[PDB]
Design a protein around this ligand. Structure first.
Ligand SMILES: [Zn+2]
Ligand SMILES: [Zn+2]
Lengths: 48, 48, 440, 145, 45, 49, 49, 95, 49, 89, 68, 317
């Protein structure tokens, strides 16, 4: 499959029961498409 | 010794040679071993 | 036995009347037993071990056919007269060489000793002393190793002193950071940046031009650069002039490592470093192909990758207590005793029940005792009896030194400052860093 | 190294000892919507085989629970407020404006909040807009004797 | 020309490209390259 | 549940504890510390005599 | 039949192998191969089955 | 951006959460200690989002009499006065 | 028992030319190398042929 | 199951006399991990532990190929997807 | 390799305390407590120069540029 | 909303309760007693002493030729951990280089040291003695061989106090005939929470002054065993004309809180082992940079600077 990372896990008590911490490396290396509308235009302009 | 001698049938004060002969006759088989180990295991687990 | 004790010392050594290695397998008769008949073996390729003959007082060798029919009393004190005709030298003689070197190996639940043997066979430790002259693919070496402070005498007898495996970590059994559950652990940051278990991997890769010479032509490819142009953007940066890389230049993934050209095409080909981790170059060997009268048709380049403790690298004491370096707490946020030593590694207390590594508690006791006075605390299996326990011996040691007798120590927490209500257990364990993290 | 909390350790049957985990990303928005509402982690509190729940805290948290809710414990004002705010940490989660507390269990000669009051305080700060408080009676693991 | 080290004799060989490789004084057939002068930096970390 | 068991005519010959875990468990038993292997036979005609 | 027999550690450091060498392994292509010990039935002793 | 006010602050600026940048428990705990010495505060407890980053969530709620920013200012001034008292005694001790 | 430190350093610095300081590693590897020694001498291949 | 396997000569271990009855030969070991277990006891303990270690996926393609659909249709009658009933309610 | 300057747990510098510790055992007949004359009060800086394998005086005997 | 009305901040009352005494002060060690300070303030002092004050230490190392057995980055690291004797407040911080990185050095920023040593064979040797200190010259590259090279104006700024490595006896590497080391190290200012080599104090920590008090007087052999329990000096055996022997605690400050007396069954009745709650005993042992008095004063000054920084940035919003 495309868009699927794989790594070793390690424990952390500070985040949440939901959340999963991802390093900024997975932040930069996994992307997903998003159409651009009037009210998220600032987010996307700043992102690009 | 109490549990073994009770199992095979003899008393605790029996001659060593007769108890030895009966024991030699016992664990050439396999079922008699099942009985002996069950009895002695009951005794030891009571102690434990 | 008697003629053997004659033959070992001064008295003349004629061809032995009866050799030691011969085993006299007497098989007594009994109904429904093994078929009875004396059996004299003299063949080679058998197993034979030594015991002490008790009527005499000297050696005697016996194999796995008289074992089952002799009463080999396992201690001087177990011997019951008129029957026990052999004594074991010392029951330590029953274990192997790697298994015997586990301090207080008779305190742990034996599955823990099994895991510790099978895991100390896999430590990132010193694979020798001649590494400059080794053409192996992947070696691992430990920069900072030491001798254990708790050790079995055979760790000296078998000459392990020349090949250390791990360092001495000031372990505090404590559930404080919170990151150390599910067997993981911490590693005091400054205790890491001052040089805790610091691995160096050696990956030596070989290049051989004789493979790319299929058939039909004579020797064509050669190492070097064709007479002509050579790209500057990478090739002249690393490779010297001869197509062989600089010694000591740091490589990255996409980097050229060697250079060879064909004769016909005259165009310089290249080979790149496949591995994904920046390694150096320490030694290149121009292997003369054979007897002589040949060009350098083989090279062997030994890259020295560096591997400090990174989050995820298994550490594991000598009891099967493997963990993972979970976060590397700052040295300021760690606890400390009245003395002030930050515990180099925080282990979790919840890991000792359901694991039975009480051997580790005893070893921590013995480490904090031996490091103080300066002893090499003897830890052979089966010395300490039920009368006076090993724990009480090391406790006498410690209370002589000055610390708490149960091993506890009054610690102040770092993130709040005021003392922990309950004292905490600090010792000096021997932490051999593992190497299973090579394929992350 | 990606980080996840301990609660999921019981669910994934993981040990944090070297086993690694595939981490996917649902691209389209329908997929992430259904992952957020149907199959998100906080909704996986009950295994399907039996009702018995599978998420929940582990070794250290539960021993410190036996040691915090115990009745010989006592806190001054500073420790109560500080420990409470460490527990809540609203800003990283959100949705709440100001943290509210209880009166102290004892008041003279020194004011002291007790541990069970800290557990009650956490429960009081997480009560929804309008749902009456929880009330319950259930045997605990540490036997009474 | 390059400067190498005979593995055993430890003698500077001065062997040129596309030549028969061997120790000029011993006859050994293994040659290490020597570490020349070159500037590298490492952070003290 | 065969030979991969540690039936005890090994006391002092092959180690009880040291043996890998998992699938090859019980097969490869490393010898004890002191167990030698007699490989040079000798003349024994004096034994029949 | 090697040129290391009877050599003392100092003359081993004079060569390129480390002081307390062990031996026992045929060097084949440069990867130290070795013949593992196998276990067989007893020599010459008529066993039952 | 050393100190900022998080998006959870009450309009009266009475229940506000400063977030001090590049700080850990070293100042957090000391300032919390000094701030508790202030009668007009109801709540004061610091935290840390994640030890990976250096940010300290603060939190100060007060009675309607005085807002929170004044409390933080007075508390920092008091902590500075404490540091000065300690340094004065220390310096006067040895010659 | 104490850490052999002086002895360790005086076996590191000036290595022994007399004989290997550690006889037990060699008695540990002795099976293989003494088996090959039995191959060459003690008339083993000659009996084979 | 039962207990230590007796070798041919009836002695549990080469330390004990034949047909030995005292429970210390039956694999009952009295010493505790805190104080330390003796050799004859340690051997039986290795026996039991390594027994455990030699003791320690096709039934998910049998009950899953046939139960692919088996979905709870809207009239609240769990049918197979081909249309046939399997259970009401 | 060489003695680990700056012992791990403490911050004390003990790089220089090896050729001056060894020549206390060597000729002074003092035992493992020789290091108490060195000034190591704790036991975290003390299990460093005590149980130290100085494995570089054995590895320096392989200069490939020996000229011999 | 409960305040206890006694937890009030009063700087006059505080400075009236605070009392400081300096027990022993040296060129390297210092131990002194703070009183009337809550755990948070004294923990802040310790936390800053360990990490938050700056100190010169080798960061970059440019090797030109290094053919010793000590690996390359291992040599760079082991150089990094050595100390440097320089007043860390006569410099400025190193603006770390973002892209556009190379030309980023000046003489107010860094200091430059260098070593070059090639161990030649020593020929005056009589016989075979692998000392090897006498067999070879320049055998061990010590730290004292890091010779300083001033960069311009520096030569004049530090003329009264030359900048040297503080421990000129550390062994940095070991060489043998033929192989050579040659490198120059650039040192910048650092803050201890980045790396360990910047931390000035070897060990800085405090202890709550323990208190030991007898509830019921002991006699005779009990008194002897008791006095034998704690380390010497802390337990006095009372000279009492009435009775024979009693025990009174001379000085609790020597005592380590080992809690050894509580181990015996009959002694646990007699004595409690507590701690005076507001009495802290600081111990500070620096490494080579500054005399510990300067350590402590710079620590509290750094605390004040952090407070003034937060206050100044708060006045903005
Ligand atoms: Zn040569
Ligand atoms: Zn230390």
């Amino acid at each position: 499959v495309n868009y699927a990372a794989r790594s070793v896990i390690s424990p952390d008590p500070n985040i949440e029961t939901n959340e999963i911490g991802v390093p900024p490396v997975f932040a930069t290396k996994l992307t997903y498409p998003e159409p651009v509308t009037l009210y998220n235009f600032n987010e996307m302009r700043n992102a690009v | 010794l109490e549990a073994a001698s009770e199992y095979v049938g003899l008393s605790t004060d029996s001659p060593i040679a007769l108890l030895n002969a009966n024991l030699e006759e016992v664990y050439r088989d396999d079922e008699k071993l099942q009985g002996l180990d069950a009895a002695m295991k009951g005794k030891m687990n009571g102690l434990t | 036995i008697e003629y053997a004790v004659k033959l070992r010392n001064g008295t003349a050594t004629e061809p032995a009347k009866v050799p030691l290695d011969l085993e006299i397998g007497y098989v007594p008769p009994s109904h429904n037993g093994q078929y009875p008949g004396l059996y004299l073996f003299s063949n080679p390729a058998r197993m034979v071990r030594p015991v002490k003959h008790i009527s005499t007082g000297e050696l005697d060798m016996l194999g796995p056919f008289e074992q089952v029919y002799m009463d080999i009393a396992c201690f001087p004190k177990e011997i019951v007269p008129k029957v026990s005709t052999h004594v074991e030298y010392s029951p330590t003689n029953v274990l192997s060489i790697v298994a015997n070197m586990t301090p207080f190996s008779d305190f742990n639940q034996s599955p823990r000793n099994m895991y510790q043997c099978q895991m100390g066979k896999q430590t990132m430790g010193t694979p020798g002393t001649a590494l400059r002259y080794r053409t192996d693919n992947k070696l691992y070496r430990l920069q900072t190793g030491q001798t254990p402070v708790v050790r079995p005498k055979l760790h000296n007898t078998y000459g392990l002193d020349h090949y250390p495996n791990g360092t001495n970590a000031v372990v505090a059994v404590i559930s404080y950071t919170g990151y150390d559950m599910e067997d993981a652990m911490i590693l005091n940051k400054s205790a890491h940046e001052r040089g805790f278990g610091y691995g160096t991997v050696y990956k030596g890769e070989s290049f051989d031009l004789s493979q790319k010479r299929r058939r039909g032509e004579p020797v064509v490819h050669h190492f070097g650069f064709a007479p002509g142009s050579t790209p500057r953007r990478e090739w002249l940066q690393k490779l010297d002039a001869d197509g062989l890389p600089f010694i000591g230049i740091k490589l990255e993934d996409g980097d050229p490592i060697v250079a060879y050209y064909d004769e016909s095409t005259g165009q310089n080909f290249i080979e790149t470093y496949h591995g994904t981790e920046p390694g150096f170059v320490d030694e290149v060997r121009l292997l003369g192909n054979d007897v002589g009268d040949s060009e350098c048709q083989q090279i062997h380049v030994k890259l020295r990758i560096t591997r400090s403790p990174i989050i995820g690298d298994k550490f594991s004491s000598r009891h099967g207590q493997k963990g993972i370096c979970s976060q590397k707490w700052p040295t300021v946020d760690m606890p400390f005793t009245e003395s002030g030593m930050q515990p180099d590694i925080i282990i979790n207390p919840h890991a000792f029940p359901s694991r039975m590594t009480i051997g580790m508690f005893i070893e921590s006791l013995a480490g904090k005792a031996g490091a103080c006075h300066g002893l090499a605390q003897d830890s052979t299996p089966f010395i300490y009896s039920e009368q006076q326990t090993a724990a009480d011996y090391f406790g006498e040691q410690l209370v002589k030194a000055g610390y708490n007798y149960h091993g506890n120590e009054p610690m102040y927490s770092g993130i709040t400052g005021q003392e922990m209500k309950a004292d905490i257990y600090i010792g000096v364990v021997y932490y051999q860093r593992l190497r299973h993290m090579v394929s992350d | 190294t990606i980080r996840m909390h301990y609660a999921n350790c019981n669910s994934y049957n993981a040990d944090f000892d070297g086993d690694e985990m595939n981490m996917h990303f649902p691209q389209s928005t329908n997929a992430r919507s259904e992952a957020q509402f149907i199959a998100n982690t906080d909704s996986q509190y009950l295994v399907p085989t039996s009702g018995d729940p599978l998420r929940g805290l582990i070794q250290d948290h539960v021993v410190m629970g036996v040691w915090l809710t115990c009745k010989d414990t006592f806190y001054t004002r500073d420790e109560y407020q500080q420990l409470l705010f460490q527990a809540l940490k609203p800003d990283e989660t959100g949705m709440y404006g100001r943290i509210k507390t209880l009166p102290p269990a004892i008041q003279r000669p020194g004011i002291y909040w007790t541990g069970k009051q800290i557990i009650s305080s956490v429960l009081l700060n997480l009560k929804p807009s309008d749902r009456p408080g929880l009330n319950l009676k259930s045997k605990a693991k540490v036997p009474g004797k | 020309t390059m400067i190498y080290l005979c593995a055993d004799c430890g003698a500077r060989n001065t062997i040129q490209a596309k030549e028969v490789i061997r120790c000029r004084e011993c006859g050994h057939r293994v040659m290490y390259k020597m570490r020349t002068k070159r500037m590298v930096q490492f952070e003290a970390r | 549940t065969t030979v991969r068991k540690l039936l005890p005519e090994a006391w002092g010959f092959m180690c009880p504890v040291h043996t890998p875990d998992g699938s090859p468990c019980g097969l490869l038993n490393h010898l004890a510390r002191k167990c030698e292997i007699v490989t040079h036979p000798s003349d024994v005609s004096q034994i029949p005599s | 039949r090697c040129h290391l027999e009877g050599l003392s550690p100092a003359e081993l450091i004079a060569h390129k192998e480390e002081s307390e060498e062990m031996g026992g392994y045929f060097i084949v292509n440069g990867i130290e191969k070795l013949i593992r010990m196998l276990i067989l039935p007893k020599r010459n002793h008529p066993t039952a089955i | 951006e050393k100190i900022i006010i998080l998006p959870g602050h009450s309009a009266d600026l009475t229940s506000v959460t400063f977030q001090i940048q590049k700080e850990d428990h070293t100042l957090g705990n000391s300032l919390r200690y000094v701030i508790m010495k202030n009668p007009e505060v109801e709540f004061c407890g610091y935290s840390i989002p994640h030890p990976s980053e250096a940010k300290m969530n603060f939190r100060i709620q007060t009675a309607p009499s005085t807002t929170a920013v004044d409390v933080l200012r007075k508390g920092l001034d008091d902590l500075i006065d404490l540091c000065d008292a300690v340094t004065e005694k220390f310096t006067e001790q040895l010659p | 028992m104490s850490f052999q430190t002086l002895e360790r350093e005086r076996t590191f610095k000036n290595p022994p030319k007399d004989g290997t300081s550690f006889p037990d590693l060699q008695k540990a590897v002795k099976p293989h190398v003494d088996s090959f020694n039995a191959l060459t001498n003690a008339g083993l291949l000659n009996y084979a042929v | 199951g039962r207990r230590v396997p007796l070798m041919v000569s009836g002695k549990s271990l080469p330390s004990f006399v034949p047909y030995e009855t005292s429970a210390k030969s039956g694999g009952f070991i009295a010493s505790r991990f805190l104080t330390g277990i003796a050799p004859q006891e340690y051997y039986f303990h290795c026996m039991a532990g390594r027994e455990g270690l030699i003791d320690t996926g096709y039934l998910q393609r049998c009950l899953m190929k046939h139960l692919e659909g088996l979905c709870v249709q809207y009239d609240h009658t769990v049918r197979d997807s081909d249309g046939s009933i399997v259970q009401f309610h | 390799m060489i003695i680990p300057i700056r012992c791990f747990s403490c911050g004390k510098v003990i790089g220089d305390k090896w050729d001056t510790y060894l020549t206390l055992l060597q000729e002074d007949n003092t035992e493992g407590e020789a290091l108490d004359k060195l000034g190591l009060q704790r036991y975290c800086c003390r299990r460093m120069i005590l149980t130290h394998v100085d494995l570089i005086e054995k590895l320096l005997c392989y200069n490939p540029l020996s000229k011999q | 909303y409960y305040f206890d009305e006694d937890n009030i901040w009063d700087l006059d009352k505080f400075k009236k309760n605070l009392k400081v005494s300096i027990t022993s002060l040296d060129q390297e060690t210092m131990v002194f007693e703070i009183s009337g300070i809550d755990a948070s303030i004294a923990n802040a002092f310790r936390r800053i002493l360990i990490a938050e004050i700056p100190t010169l230490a080798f960061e970059f190392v440019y090797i030109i030729n290094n053919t010793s057995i000590i690996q390359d980055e291992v040599l760079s690291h082991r150089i990094g951990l050595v100390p440097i004797s320089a007043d860390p407040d006569m410099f400025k911080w190193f603006q770390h280089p973002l892209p556009g990185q190379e030309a980023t050095h000046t003489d107010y920023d860094t200091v430059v040291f260098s070593l070059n040593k090639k161990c030649e064979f020593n020929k005056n040797a009589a016989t075979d003695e692998k000392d090897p200190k006498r067999l070879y010259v320049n055998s061990e590259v010590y730290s004292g061989d890091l010779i300083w090279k001033p960069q311009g104006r520096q030569e004049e700024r530090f003329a009264d106090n030359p900048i040297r490595v503080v421990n000129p006896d550390i062994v940095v590497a070991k060489l043998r005939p033929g192989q050579e080391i040659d490198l120059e190290a650039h040192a910048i200012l650092g803050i201890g929470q980045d790396h360990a080599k910047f931390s000035p104090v070897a060990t800085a920590s405090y202890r709550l002054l323990p208190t030991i008090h007898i509830l019921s007087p002991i006699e005779g052999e009990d008194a002897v065993k008791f006095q034998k329990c704690f380390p010497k000096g802390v337990i006095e055996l009372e000279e009492g004309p009435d009775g024979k022997k009693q025990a009174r605690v001379a000085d609790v400050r020597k005592d380590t809180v080992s809690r050894e007396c509580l181990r015996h069954p009959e002694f646990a009745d007699k004595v409690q082992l507590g701690r005076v709650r507001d009495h802290y005993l600081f111990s500070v042992e620096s490494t080579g940079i500054m005399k510990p008095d300067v350590l402590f004063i710079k620590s509290i000054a750094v605390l004040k600077s952090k407070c003034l920084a937060v206050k100044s940035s708060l006045q903005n919003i």
